[PDB]
Design a protein around this ligand. Structure first.
Ligand code: MHR
Ligand code: MG
Lengths: 262, 298
């Protein structure tokens, strides 16, 4: 399976583990933001999930955009009326980076219901690029997940789709998920998905690869377990609606386990 | 900086991009290549976005070095280290005597080094051709132009079907496979290996079908034995002529036993079986590798 890059898989994972620390947003940035909140950010990310659905963009693209926004907001103060411009420019850049066929700038202007002009979007693109210093190849939860999926005996579509769903729910809530690295959220999501569907746990072979155990994953796992349990009541619902789709095997309709029995 | 510290010398290349200029830093004396990218009505091109982000990460002796990015309202300059010539022009200069073996062997070893570094950092180049391979006066060869490059995930998703200049394009791209991987870059380097030896393109097709048929006539038409899954491929046709595989000593007659062995592993039909850049570095072909200077003034 050259598609699974046997000769480079380990080098790549190691590389991504270095890069995720370097590409990490500052944990306590929302406190330093005078005019925006975790709640406003949650509204923004939920809207981006809708945008991704409307243009049928990759989930990877949505993950990159969120990373760009969080890093931009780690150094740049933004007024609430300008938060969606940051988000639109981040999604344009993510699309150009990750998509075969990114939507046109005009399409990105249109989805803001003409809150902003094309000039504004294009100008913000430049600003985001400057703030990020063109450092756009950031590791995401999905890049770790797809490597973790290779450790299934055998591969299970429900496990995979559910793991993605959970990793995607974590994008909505800065508190608490800003304090966890993509690789750790991917690990928690994968174990939680595996447990929900098959009753199985984080496998020994992934301890070998990652150095993560159920003991080190516990904090994030306890957070993700509570997010999953509360998902139907969360003010933001675009991911749940998205993951009802057959494309993702209707996994948002599966029931969360009451306990983790850790 | 910058821009006021650079004195343009001349145009040294073009394409898209982009225009490339030879320039010199007035304060340090450093000679550089400026890749000028014109901006506008879709903002910064995805080609430039990918090339800058990827080249900022990739620091290797065999990969072109991005020194700086000068990014104003209407202009984008990529500042690169200057290299004196591309491999194509070097091959053209080398008619009548050819390129010495130690130099071909050195160049290939360095290309596999640069490529394995790319692959270890989840980057596919996707346009390895002699025009994008740059040489200096000290014996170095470097991969350049990452506008067509891509950061991949493991395992790979479906990426752009283009892809790769026709002559250097792998049979799995030509046959419309849902996935392609690191092996596409190896295929390209295989073609280039042959071309360094012969100073002519191994598979000079004028269309996709002609490209495929030229490969088939040289390597044999692949069946399920040599390439499990090939008859199931999207653009495979049962009507394809069934050419016999050539004696491999007839594909590149001046090449020795170890050279032939390696080339055949780079040109393996099955992308799963094709040699990796990393594994190719340990091939017996390179047992006596050195890094001499080019034998001609650049
Ligand atoms: C390939 C066209 C000729 O361009 C050059 C000629 C001489 N030295 C050089 N150093 C760097 C460039 C170059 C050009 C295009 N893309 C990239 N990434 N780099 C370059
Ligand atoms: Mg605040």
């Amino acid at each position: 399976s050259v598609n699974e890059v046997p000769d480079y898989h380990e080098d790549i994972h190691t590389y991504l583990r270095e890069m995720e620390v370097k590409c990490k947003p500052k944990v306590g940035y929302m406190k330093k933001q005078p005019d925006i909140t975790n709640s406003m950010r949650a509204i923004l990310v939920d809207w981006l999930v809708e945008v991704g659905e409307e243009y049928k963009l990759q989930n990877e693209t949505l993950h990159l955009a969120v990373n760009y926004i969080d890093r931009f907001l780690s150094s740049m103060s933004v007024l609430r009326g300008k938060l969606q411009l940051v988000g639109t420019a981040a999604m344009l850049l993510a699309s150009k980076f990750e998509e075969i066929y990114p939507p046109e700038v005009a399409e990105f202007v249109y989805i803001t219901d003409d809150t902003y002009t094309k000039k504004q979007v294009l100008r913000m693109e430049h600003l985001v690029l400057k703030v990020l210093a063109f450092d756009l190849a950031a590791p995401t939860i999905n890049q770790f997940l797809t490597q973790y999926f290779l450790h299934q005996q055998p591969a299970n579509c429900k496990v995979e789709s559910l793991a993605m769903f959970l990793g995607e729910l974590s994008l909505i809530d800065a508190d608490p998920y800003l304090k966890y690295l993509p690789s750790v959220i991917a690990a928690a999501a994968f174990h939680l998905a595996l447990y929900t569907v098959t009753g199985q746990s984080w496998p020994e072979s992934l301890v070998q690869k990652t150095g993560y155990t159920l003991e080190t994953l516990k904090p994030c796992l306890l957070d993700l377990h509570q997010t999953y349990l509360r998902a139907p009541q969360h003010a933001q619902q675009s991911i749940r609606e998205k993951y009802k789709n057959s494309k993702y095997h209707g996994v948002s309709l599966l029931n969360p386990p009451e306990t983790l029995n850790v | 900086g910058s821009m006021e510290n650079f004195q343009k010398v001349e145009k040294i290349g073009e394409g898209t991009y982009g225009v490339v200029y030879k320039a010199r830093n007035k304060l340090t004396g450093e000679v550089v290549a400026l890749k000028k990218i014109r901006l506008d009505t879709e903002g910064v091109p995805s080609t430039a976005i990918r090339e800058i982000s990827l080249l900022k990460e990739l620091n290797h002796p065999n990969i072109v070095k991005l020194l700086d990015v000068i990014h104003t309202e209407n202009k984008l300059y990529l500042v690169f280290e200057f290299l004196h010539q591309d491999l194509k022009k070097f091959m053209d200069a080398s008619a009548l005597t050819g390129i010495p073996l130690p130099l071909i062997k050195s160049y290939l070893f360095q290309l596999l080094q640069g490529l394995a570094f790319c692959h270890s950092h989840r980057v596919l180049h996707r346009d390895l051709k002699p025009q994008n391979l740059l040489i200096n006066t000290e014996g170095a060869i470097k991969l350049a132009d990452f506008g067509l490059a891509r950061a991949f995930g493991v395992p790979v998703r479906t990426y752009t079907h283009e892809v790769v200049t026709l002559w250097y394009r792998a049979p799995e791209i030509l046959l419309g496979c849902k996935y392609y991987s690191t092996a596409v870059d190896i295929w390209s380097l295989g073609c280039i290996f042959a071309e360094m030896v012969t100073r002519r393109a191994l598979f000079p097709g004028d269309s996709e079908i002609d490209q495929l048929f030229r490969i088939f006539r040289t390597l044999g038409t692949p069946d399920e034995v040599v390439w499990p899954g090939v008859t199931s491929m999207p653009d495979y046709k049962p009507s394809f002529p069934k050419w016999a595989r050539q004696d491999f000593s007839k594909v590149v007659p001046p090449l020795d036993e170890d050279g032939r062995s390696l080339l055949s592993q780079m040109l393996h039909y099955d992308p799963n079986k094709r040699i990796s850049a990393k594994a190719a570095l340990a091939h017996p072909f390179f047992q006596d590798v050195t890094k001499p200077v080019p034998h001609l003034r650049l």
